[PDB]
Symmetry: none
């Protein structure tokens, strides 16, 4: 479990339920 410069996400939405859910 050696992790050098890992877990990279760029410009991310992560662990998200409703994205843009509008006009109800």
């Amino acid at each position: 479990n050696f992790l050098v410069h890992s877990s990279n996400n760029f410009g991310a939405i992560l662990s998200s339920t409703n994205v843009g859910s509008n006009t109800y």
Copy 2:
């Protein structure tokens, strides 16, 4: 379990339920 610069995702939405679900 040696991970150098891994788990790369770019511009990502990850673990997401409803994307753009609109006008209900």
Copy 3:
């Protein structure tokens, strides 16, 4: 289990239920 610069996904939506599900 040696992973150099692996698990790359670009511009991804991953683990996602409803994409664009609109106008209900």
Copy 4:
């Protein structure tokens, strides 16, 4: 189980239920 720069998917939606399912 030696993985150099593997598991590449680009522009992907992966593990996804309904894609574009609209106008219900």
Copy 5:
């Protein structure tokens, strides 16, 4: 189980139930 730069899929939707299933 030596995998150099394998498991490549590009522009993919993978493990997906309903693609484009619309107008119900």
Copy 6:
């Protein structure tokens, strides 16, 4: 030129020159 929900392509790479062209 009436187009209702047309021009659908799913999981597509379109207008593309070299796909997977590797190991030169």
Copy 7:
């Protein structure tokens, strides 16, 4: 030129030159 919910592409790479072109 009436377009209702057209031009749909999902999980797409479009207008792209070299996809995965690696190891030169």
Copy 8:
């Protein structure tokens, strides 16, 4: 030129030159 909810692309990389072009 009436466009209701058109030009939808999901999880896309679009207008892109080199995708994943690595290890030169």
Copy 9:
């Protein structure tokens, strides 16, 4: 040129030159 909720792209990288181009 009437556009209701158009030009939707989700999780996108768009107008992009080199994606993931690494290890030179």
Copy 10:
């Protein structure tokens, strides 16, 4: 040129040159 809630991109990198270009 009537645009109601248009030009939606979520989690996006847009107009971008080099994404993740590392280890030179």
